[PDB]
Structure 1
Amino acid sequence: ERPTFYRQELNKTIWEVPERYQNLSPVGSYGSVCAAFDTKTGLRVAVKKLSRPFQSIIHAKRTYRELRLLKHMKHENVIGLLDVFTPARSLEEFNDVYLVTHLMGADLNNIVKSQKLTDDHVQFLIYQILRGLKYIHSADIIHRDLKPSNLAVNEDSELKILDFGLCVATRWYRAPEIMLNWMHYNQTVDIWSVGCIMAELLTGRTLFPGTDHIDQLKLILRLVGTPGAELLKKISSESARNYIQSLTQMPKMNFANVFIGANPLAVDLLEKMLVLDSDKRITAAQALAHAYFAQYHDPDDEPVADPYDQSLESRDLLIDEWKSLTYDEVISFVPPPL
């Protein structure tokens, strides 16, 4: 029942895939992606060939982690795994991993650049991000790079969260605590990102268009206000505190005056996302129950992740141990229903 593989060279990369996958066409290059046609199903898929997956410890772990994660992501608003394969017949020759998903077209960036969004459109797009994030966050995973170009939006405005490689600067959507190199992060960093995206769908422009992380920080403080005493004290570096203290003391802007033409409920939600203290930001679960989404909110259809443990950053293993765990997951993979 092993499929028949065929070999092919594209952009100085060898691709060896099952014959069911035809018309491979490179769309991006750590892992490179081909648009392809699944002859079995008639569907357009993306095939990602991971770059040298077991050639560094960092790669081996990431490889295992992406596979184990995606094997368990089964949600309307999160990318799912259609297939996973390797040309290896044994663990001893296992050097390559390929992941297959539905092929995405436009991202959220294509939307906001192509049109001005009505409030209902903003509602549906943001609701779907939060529903997916609720699910991702429940598995104890942080996305860390939630931005419009990582958000696929199909022709009927169905949104999926994924990692789009480099197929819009990341720093525009980054919580301030990441750019301050805070060692430990809340999932709340992603909610900061949603606030930035939501603002941009309401106004049509990047909320905080920093040219670098210092500019980025200045722009942030201009809107939310410079931190108070207790926030300041959580910043352990005196030089960092001194630089922050040295900035002209910015008052907190009134979001209702800033976003003057927006739904007052969108503005209220915005205020709850873009709070400086990460402990005080609304959660995705809480956000979903916000009155802004009363049109789309259904507490019986906002599910959470299955019970598999996906908390792996803490885990230290040997390079060949990550490969063998990865091999087990490839072998035990069972393709989803239609």
Structure 2
Amino acid sequence: RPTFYRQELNKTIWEVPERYQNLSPVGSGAYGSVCAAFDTKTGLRVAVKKLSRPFQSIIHAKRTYRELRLLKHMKHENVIGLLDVFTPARSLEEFNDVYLVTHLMGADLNNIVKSQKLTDDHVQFLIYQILRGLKYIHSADIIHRDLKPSNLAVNEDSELKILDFGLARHTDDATRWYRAPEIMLNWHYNQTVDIWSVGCIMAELLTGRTLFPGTDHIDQLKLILRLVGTPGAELLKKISSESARNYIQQMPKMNFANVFIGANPLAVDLLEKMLVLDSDKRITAAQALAHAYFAQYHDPDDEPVADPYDQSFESRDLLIDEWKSLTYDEVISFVPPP
């Protein structure tokens, strides 16, 4: 077992193995607290997260287990994963704090873009990576559901990782804009809700402007439907509720070639396939990777899928100490990546 040391940062007490040196605050919130550190074992700059009240309640405990299970399963270049998980506890009976370690990330997609058009080649590379990560996430039967530029970390090499959180804003420094209409309308949904978000992101990277900057929930839907049209006959046949059919209903789809003026025609074609109203007809991540737009990056032998992901715990109602013990097992069984 490593030697630990204690340090106070922004009024939060940190107890970490000596390998993590030079702790500096990154941020804190409902998520707990995050510090940056230097990992002396690897020479990497890392972020360390101390979870907030991980076993305070059944729900917190289950949330902690969920978070750790997911992070341990996600092993892909374009998805956030774990370098380390630790606890100062020497036994289950002492186990009260959980610390997670990953690569320190310093910028998100908004930070790289800065309200500017990116070049088409840069868009290809970034969207390729998002789709590559999504193919992996979706293959684990996970839907991200909240994909947006703030959840996309991008380093100086434009290497991209999909996050389920936003990076901390410097102390001296809408979500709905990327949400699929079926979620906005409360309609059954599939993994292509995330593909909608990617289409929104891609549009913005190409044009330098938010595709659907709705002022509120109703406005958001109005902006979406102006582009993608009111539901056609085939989609209306799939809406089970009378009131729902009575509600959504009046203009036809716009021709995206007349919207995304000067864009690569293959980009326009891909956007048409991602921004389809009917989610049954929306392109999947795997299909999108094979689209001609990505011909310079696509490698069908290097777009891996995840191992099957057992999420049966989601259906279980257990006690705190049970979730705590399951979590502790997961801490102990952790094997760092190479």
Q: Residues 204 and 311 from structure 1, CA distance in 2 versus in 1: closer, same or farther, beyond 3 angstroms?
A: farther
Most deviating of 211-220 and 310-319: 310-319
Aligned to 1:71: 72
Q: Residues 55 and 237 from structure 1, CA distance in 2 versus in 1: closer, same or farther, beyond 3 angstroms?
A: farther
**Distance in 1, Cα, partners of 2:226 & 2:178:** 15
What TM-score do the two structures reach when normalised by structure 1?
Answer: 0.92
Identity of aligned residues (%): 99
Whether the 8 Å CA contact 1:5–1:87 is kept in 2: the answer is yes
Q: Residues 178 and 70 from structure 1, CA distance in 2 versus in 1: closer, same or farther, beyond 3 angstroms?
A: same
Matched, 1:11 2:10: yes
Q: CA deviation at 1:278?
A: 1.2
Whether the 8 Å CA contact 2:61–2:323 is kept in 1: the answer is yes
Most deviating of 7-16 and 192-201: 7-16
Whether the 8 Å CA contact 1:69–1:310 is kept in 2: the answer is no
Q: CA deviation at 1:212?
A: 1.6
Q: Residues 259 and 115 from structure 1, CA distance in 2 versus in 1: closer, same or farther, beyond 3 angstroms?
A: closer
Whether the 8 Å CA contact 1:81–1:99 is kept in 2: the answer is yes
Whether the 8 Å CA contact 1:67–1:329 is kept in 2: the answer is yes
Q: Residues 78 and 195 from structure 1, CA distance in 2 versus in 1: closer, same or farther, beyond 3 angstroms?
A: same
Aligned to 1:219: 223
**Distance in 1, Cα, partners of 2:314 & 2:59:** 11
Q: Where do residues 79-158 of structure 1 align in structure 2 (5 Å cutoff)?
A: 79-113=80-114, 115-158=116-159
Residues 289-332 of structure 1: CA deviation (Å, up to 9, x unaligned): 01111111111111101234246533433332221111101001
Q: CA deviation at 1:114?
A: 6.5
Q: Residues 319 and 244 from structure 1, CA distance in 2 versus in 1: closer, same or farther, beyond 3 angstroms?
A: same
**Distance in 2, Cα, partners of 1:14 & 1:328:** 24
Whether the 8 Å CA contact 1:82–1:336 is kept in 2: the answer is yes
Structure 2 residue matching 1:99: 3-state secondary structure: strand
For structure 2, the 5+ residue unaligned runs are 169-173
Q: CA deviation at 1:70?
A: 1.4
Q: CA deviation at 1:158?
A: 0.8
**Distance in 2, Cα, partners of 1:333 & 1:16:** 19
Q: CA deviation at 1:117?
A: 1.3
Residues 168-211 of structure 1: CA deviation (Å, up to 9, x unaligned): x21111111222233x4311111010000010011011111112
Residues 69-122 of structure 1: CA deviation (Å, up to 9, x unaligned): 211222111112110001111212212111000001111111211643111111
Q: CA deviation at 1:261?
A: 0.8
**Distance in 2, Cα, partners of 1:4 & 1:255:** 60
Q: CA deviation at 1:5?
A: 1.6
Whether the 8 Å CA contact 1:140–1:311 is kept in 2: the answer is no
- How many residues were matched structurally? 331
For structure 1, the 5+ residue unaligned runs are none
Q: Residues 314 and 270 from structure 1, CA distance in 2 versus in 1: closer, same or farther, beyond 3 angstroms?
A: farther
Structure 1 residue matching 2:243: 3-state secondary structure: helix
Whether the 8 Å CA contact 2:192–2:279 is kept in 1: the answer is yes
Q: CA deviation at 1:57?
A: 2.6
Whether the 8 Å CA contact 1:108–1:148 is kept in 2: the answer is yes
Whether the 8 Å CA contact 2:141–2:309 is kept in 1: the answer is no
Whether the 8 Å CA contact 2:115–2:208 is kept in 1: the answer is no
Whether the 8 Å CA contact 1:82–1:101 is kept in 2: the answer is yes
**Distance in 2, Cα, partners of 1:158 & 1:165:** 17
Most deviating of 85-94 and 191-200: 85-94
Residues 98-155 of structure 1: CA deviation (Å, up to 9, x unaligned): 1000001111111211643111111011001001100111111111111111111111
Residues 245-304 of structure 1: CA deviation (Å, up to 9, x unaligned): 2xxx12111101101111111111101111111111100011000111111111111110
Most deviating of 68-77 and 324-333: 68-77
Whether the 8 Å CA contact 2:115–2:209 is kept in 1: the answer is no
Aligned to 2:269: 268
**Distance in 2, Cα, partners of 1:31 & 1:181:** 31
Structure 1 residue matching 2:24: 3-state secondary structure: strand
Whether the 8 Å CA contact 1:139–1:310 is kept in 2: the answer is no
Q: CA deviation at 1:234?
A: 4.4
Most deviating of 27-36 and 235-244: 235-244
**Distance in 1, Cα, partners of 2:145 & 2:32:** 18
**Distance in 1, Cα, partners of 2:60 & 2:195:** 28
**Distance in 2, Cα, partners of 1:311 & 1:153:** 33
**Distance in 2, Cα, partners of 1:39 & 1:231:** 56
Q: CA deviation at 1:165?
A: 4.0
